Scaffold this active site. Structure first.
Site: not given
Ligand SMILES: O=C1CN2C(=NN1)COc1ccccc12
Length: 252
Positions: A15-18, A85, A87, A131, A135-136, A149
């Site tokens: 669903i995304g990148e960290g 959790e 989101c 920060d 974006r966060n 984060d």
């Molecule tokens: O801790 C999180 C990290 N995260 C999500 N949910 N919870 C869902 O959307 C995201 C989209 C991109 C990166 C992280 C998330």
């Protein structure tokens, strides 16, 4: 005990990148079918990386606020995962951009209000963020955002000049974050070089009033951008003012 048995987790789509690796959505079966976010770590087979990755989870344990993403648990053996959790609606910036013409003003103000509550909470815990940016921030639902984060374009002049970081410099950054939301996820100072940002601010120049932003709300953003940190409102004052702007907007 935050350790989760891997067999309780069904890994779903990315669903995304960290910083450490891909973030996936998934299912957590506990004593049933809870939708979760799973943060992965590419290099966690190395303990130096593992310790840094798992430190983030330990940081999350300290907070308990409706507008801050909650830690569910960890899986400490390879592949190392952090269970958070979910989101569901994802990153705020993308959400604002895709919904530019479909989110009303009351929703945009509500996101700024909710974020000020989470930041006033962190201020009350004596936690300086450093920060604050769109974006966060993650989107739980159409009516709920949560904190998740050098970023010169978001930074207070005292942080750029002298590496001074306080709750007042967090207030400056939050003023920029409020501008970003009202701008439907457009980044500040586009086409301006980082080293020329301080000069423009020193010259008294500030980010302009976003189109359709109420003057009372733009005025509150400019107070966050007072050159003197002591003249900036506190997060608690931001919260009270955003509540009134939200109610006035909800009334029409
Ligand atoms: O801790 C999180 C990290 N995260 C999500 N949910 N919870 C869902 O959307 C995201 C989209 C991109 C990166 C992280 C998330």
């Amino acid at each position: 005990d935050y350790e989760i048995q891997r067999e309780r987790i069904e890994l779903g789509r990315c669903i995304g990148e960290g910083q450490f690796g891909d973030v996936h959505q998934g299912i957590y079966m506990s004593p049933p079918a809870l939708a979760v976010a799973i943060k992965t770590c590419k290099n966690c087979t190395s303990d130096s990386v593992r310790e840094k990755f798992l430190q983030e989870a330990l940081t999350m344990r300290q907070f308990d606020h409706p507008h801050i993403v909650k830690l569910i648990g960890v899986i400490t053996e390879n592949p190392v995962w952090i269970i958070m959790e979910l989101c569901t609606l994802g990153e705020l910036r993308s959400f604002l951009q895709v919904r530019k013409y479909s989110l009303d003003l009351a929703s945009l103000i509500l996101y700024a209000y909710q974020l000020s509550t989470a930041l006033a909470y962190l201020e009350s815990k004596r936690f300086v963020h450093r920060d604050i940016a769109a974006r966060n921030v993650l989107v739980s639902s159409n009516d709920c955002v949560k904190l998740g984060d050098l970023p010169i374009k978001w930074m207070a002049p005292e942080s750029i000049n002298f590496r001074r970081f306080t709750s007042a410099s967090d207030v400056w950054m939050f003023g920029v974050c409020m501008w970003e939301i009202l701008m439907h996820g457009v980044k500040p100072f586009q086409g301006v070089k980082n080293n020329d940002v301080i000069g423009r601010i020193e010259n008294g120049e500030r980010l302009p009033m976003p189109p359709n932003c109420p003057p009372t709300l733009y005025s509150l953003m400019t107070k966050c951008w007072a050159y003197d940190p002591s003249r900036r409102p506190r997060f608690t004052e931001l919260k009270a003012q955003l509540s009134t702007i939200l109610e006035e907007e909800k009334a029409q």
